[PDB]
């Protein structure tokens, strides 16, 4: 059995979309407020997260079917999944060696420690690293990693979503491609698909935990003033 | 004739306040999003203006009499005069030689050109330089420069001000010190005082012009997203 001309074209678009929105050299990071090791890392990570939102948005607009949803549903989907897509795409810079995100020399090597100088506790940063390690081990192909991001972004179960039947349909078609692709092109991945869907569940927990921490942060103006307009909007609840 | 123990203590506080909020080495500028020469200079100047707002606020809180006004009046005064105080304090880094603000090596040397890569036109940047040149020539003492900033910040004629009689009184006392100081300690400054008050008028024009340019900028989200929470609040009209 094999993939259809349809599923194949979906993959082409997603992989191209990703390449178009993710620089493996992280050259743009020099434009962020420099890191510093009262939350000395907040200005840098805020800029990093903000830069990522923009990237996740560019990627989403190229997810086939997404541009056709209502503006409102597009926003509802982006708002609730943004933090998860960031965690997923960051796997690409996560090194199991140093248990950190290597995005450059010393300055752009993000260690668990740094995120703490940004308003987050270690008891909560632990599941994140645990997630990154598990995800890294799945040794996903670019096609599976790019599909996993689209699947996550099209979850019908997000607050604020309207046409949850149409989002439901789009996601299923994507889940099919991932399932078919894994079977056809992935030697040894008979149980991979089920592992990937389990990552979606973990992201939910990580998402909920981030909301709580971010909430505290956003109620303190001395801190929220350090965020960027876009982060305040995506993570804000003015929805 | 001479200054009173009162006027003298006002001066001590203002000069100290200024020293406490203005670094002549501009060492903090390395924490701003780096300059770049669609408005490539906006992220840097936004951070510069934002950093300055915070400084102007710290200076204001030490202006004797100011901390006693209502929170609302303090905000009304800061909102409407912030841009003017920035223009005044920046005289300290303005070099008549290169007609620019020298705040560092090549990267932090602000030329008329750069401000254009930030949303502003040259036909409007012209009065600014003209103002900086005139102000520089007045060769003010630190006591006169610091007084001029306090006088400007306590102008009763600002939209949103409530107790314009109390702000009126505070400013007069400050205008008296400046007048007395110039007479007692400033050789050759018989007409200086009148020149300084004329600078206040010019700042009004510059302020009004900035509002118009900033307004256009703030209605375009692709651009306003580049500003900082504090700039959006101080220059915003949600007042």
């Amino acid at each position: 059995h094999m993939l259809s001309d349809e599923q194949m074209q979906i993959i082409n678009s997603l992989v191209e979309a990703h390449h178009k929105t993710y620089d493996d050299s992280y050259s743009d990071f020099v434009r962020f407020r420099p890191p510093v090791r009262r939350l000395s890392m907040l200005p840098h990570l805020a800029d990093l997260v903000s830069y990522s939102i923009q990237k996740v948005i560019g990627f989403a607009k190229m997810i086939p079917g997404f541009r056709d949803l209502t503006a409102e549903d597009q926003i509802a989907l982006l708002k609730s999944s943004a933090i998860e897509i960031i965690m997923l795409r960051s796997n690409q810079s996560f090194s199991l060696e140093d248990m950190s995100w290597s995005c450059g020399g010393p300055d752009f090597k993000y260690c668990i420690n740094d995120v703490t100088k940004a308003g987050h506790t270690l008891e909560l940063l632990e599941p994140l690293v645990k997630f990154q390690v598990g995800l890294k081990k799945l040794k996903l192909h670019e096609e599976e990693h790019v599909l996993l991001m689209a699947i996550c972004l099209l979850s019908p179960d997000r607050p604020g979503v309207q046409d949850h039947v149409r989002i439901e349909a789009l996601q299923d078609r994507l889940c099919d491609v991932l399932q078919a692709y894994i079977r056809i092109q992935h030697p040894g991945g008979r149980l991979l698909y089920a592992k990937m869907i389990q990552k979606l569940a973990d992201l939910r927990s990580l998402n909920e935990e981030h909301s709580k921490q971010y909430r505290s942060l956003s109620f303190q103006p001395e801190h929220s003033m350090q965020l960027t307009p876009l982060v305040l909007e995506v993570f804000g609840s003015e929805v | 004739h001479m200054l009173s123990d009162e006027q003298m203590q006002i001066i001590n506080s203002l000069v100290e306040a200024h020293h406490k909020t203005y670094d002549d080495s501009y060492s903090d500028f390395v924490r701003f999003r780096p300059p770049v020469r669609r408005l490539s200079m906006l992220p840097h100047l936004a951070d510069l203006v934002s950093y300055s707002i915070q400084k102007v606020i710290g200076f204001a809180k030490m202006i004797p009499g100011f901390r006693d006004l209502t929170a609302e009046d303090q905000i009304a005064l800061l909102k409407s005069s912030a841009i003017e105080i920035i223009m005044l304090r920046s005289n300290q880094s303005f070099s008549l030689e290169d007609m620019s603000w020298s705040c560092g090596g090549p990267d932090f040397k602000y030329c008329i050109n750069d401000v254009t890569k930030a949303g502003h036109t040259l036909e409007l940047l012209e009065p600014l330089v003209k103002f900086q040149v005139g102000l520089k020539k007045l060769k003010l003492h630190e006591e006169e420069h610091v007084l001029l900033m306090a006088i400007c910040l306590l102008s009763p004629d600002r939209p949103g001000v409530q107790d314009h009689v109390r702000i009126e009184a505070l400013q007069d006392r400050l205008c008296d010190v400046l007048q007395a100081y110039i007479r007692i300690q400033h050789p050759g400054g018989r007409l200086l005082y009148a020149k300084m008050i004329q600078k206040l008028a010019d700042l009004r024009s510059l302020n009004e012009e900035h509002s118009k340019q900033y307004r256009s900028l703030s209605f375009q989200p692709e651009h306003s997203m580049q500003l900082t929470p504090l700039v959006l609040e101080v220059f915003g009209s949600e007042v």
Partner: peptide, 10 residues
Amino acid sequence: KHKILHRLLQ
């Protein structure tokens, strides 16, 4: 109002 998001979404 999500001004930024609407804008970035074209």
